[PDB]
Coordinates of C-alpha atoms in Angstrom, one line a residue:
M1 CA -8.2 -15.7 -9.1
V2 CA -7.5 -18.3 -6.3
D3 CA -9.5 -21.0 -4.5
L4 CA -9.8 -22.3 -0.9
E5 CA -7.4 -19.6 0.4
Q6 CA -9.9 -16.8 -0.4
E7 CA -12.6 -18.4 1.9
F8 CA -12.3 -17.5 5.6
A9 CA -10.2 -20.2 7.1
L10 CA -9.9 -21.4 10.7
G11 CA -6.7 -19.6 11.5
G12 CA -6.3 -18.0 8.1
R13 CA -5.1 -14.5 8.0
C14 CA -7.7 -12.0 7.0
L15 CA -8.1 -8.3 6.2
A16 CA -10.8 -6.1 7.8
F17 CA -11.7 -2.8 6.3
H18 CA -12.4 0.3 8.4
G19 CA -12.7 3.0 5.6
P20 CA -9.6 5.3 5.8
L21 CA -7.7 2.0 5.5
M22 CA -7.9 -1.7 6.2
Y23 CA -6.0 -3.5 9.0
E24 CA -4.8 -7.0 8.8
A25 CA -6.8 -9.6 10.7
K26 CA -6.2 -13.2 12.0
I27 CA -9.3 -15.3 12.5
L28 CA -9.6 -17.5 15.6
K29 CA -13.0 -17.6 17.3
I30 CA -15.6 -18.0 14.7
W31 CA -19.3 -17.5 14.9
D32 CA -22.4 -18.7 13.1
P33 CA -25.9 -17.3 13.7
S34 CA -27.4 -20.8 13.2
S35 CA -26.9 -21.2 17.0
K36 CA -25.8 -17.5 17.8
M37 CA -22.8 -18.9 19.7
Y38 CA -19.1 -19.3 18.8
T39 CA -16.4 -21.9 18.3
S40 CA -12.5 -21.9 18.4
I41 CA -9.4 -24.0 18.2
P42 CA -6.0 -23.6 20.0
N43 CA -4.0 -23.7 16.6
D44 CA -2.6 -20.4 17.9
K45 CA -3.8 -17.7 20.4
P46 CA -5.6 -14.3 20.2
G47 CA -2.7 -12.3 21.7
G48 CA -4.7 -10.7 24.6
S49 CA -4.9 -14.4 25.9
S50 CA -2.3 -17.1 25.8
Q51 CA -4.3 -19.7 23.8
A52 CA -7.8 -20.7 22.6
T53 CA -8.0 -23.8 24.8
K54 CA -9.4 -26.7 22.7
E55 CA -12.2 -27.4 20.1
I56 CA -14.4 -24.9 22.0
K57 CA -18.0 -26.2 22.3
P58 CA -20.5 -23.5 21.2
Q59 CA -21.5 -22.0 24.4
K60 CA -23.4 -18.9 25.6
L61 CA -20.9 -16.0 25.3
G62 CA -19.9 -12.7 26.9
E63 CA -16.7 -13.5 28.7
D64 CA -14.6 -10.8 27.1
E65 CA -16.4 -10.1 23.7
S66 CA -19.7 -9.2 22.1
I67 CA -20.9 -9.5 18.5
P68 CA -23.3 -6.5 17.7
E69 CA -26.4 -7.4 15.7
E70 CA -24.8 -5.5 12.8
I71 CA -22.4 -8.4 12.2
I72 CA -24.2 -11.3 13.9
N73 CA -26.4 -12.1 10.9
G74 CA -23.4 -13.6 9.1
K75 CA -20.2 -15.4 9.8
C76 CA -18.2 -13.5 12.4
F77 CA -14.5 -13.8 13.3
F78 CA -12.8 -12.7 16.5
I79 CA -9.6 -11.6 14.9
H80 CA -6.2 -10.3 16.1
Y81 CA -5.9 -6.9 14.3
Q82 CA -2.2 -6.9 13.5
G83 CA -0.1 -3.7 13.7
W84 CA -2.3 -2.8 16.7
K85 CA -2.6 -3.5 20.4
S86 CA -3.9 -6.9 21.3
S87 CA -6.8 -5.0 23.0
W88 CA -8.2 -5.0 19.4
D89 CA -8.8 -8.8 19.7
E90 CA -12.3 -8.2 18.4
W91 CA -14.9 -9.8 16.1
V92 CA -15.9 -8.4 12.7
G93 CA -18.4 -9.8 10.2
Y94 CA -17.9 -10.4 6.5
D95 CA -19.4 -6.9 6.1
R96 CA -15.8 -5.7 6.9
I97 CA -13.5 -8.8 6.6
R98 CA -12.1 -11.2 4.0
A99 CA -9.5 -14.0 4.3
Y100 CA -5.8 -13.6 3.2
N101 CA -5.3 -13.6 -0.6
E102 CA -3.6 -11.6 -3.4
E103 CA -6.7 -9.6 -4.3
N104 CA -7.0 -8.4 -0.7
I105 CA -3.3 -7.7 -0.7
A106 CA -3.9 -5.7 -3.9
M107 CA -6.4 -3.8 -1.8
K108 CA -3.8 -3.7 1.1
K109 CA -0.9 -2.3 -1.1
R110 CA -3.2 0.2 -2.9
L111 CA -4.4 1.4 0.6
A112 CA -1.0 1.5 2.2
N113 CA 0.1 3.8 -0.6
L114 CA -2.5 6.3 0.9
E115 CA -1.3 5.9 4.5

């Protein structure tokens, strides 16, 4: 068991499950249904864009992304799916993602054995 690192973190790594496998994630633009708008920081960059500008004010969205109602109802994270094209800079909900930790790496290494 661990603490703090297992929570989603602003610019933590993450893991987002598909079913056949999971693919590694990197949280950047984070979303909260309390306003149904998003937030970001330029600590790094998506990959499909050069940065994440500043402490992004929560603003009406739809510039290059959409959260479906499926994920909206919780914390969502626009993540860089690593090992894949930056075209996969996409949000997921907690329904599929968790932050970087050894338990999710135990899931990663068990899964990668099946690849």
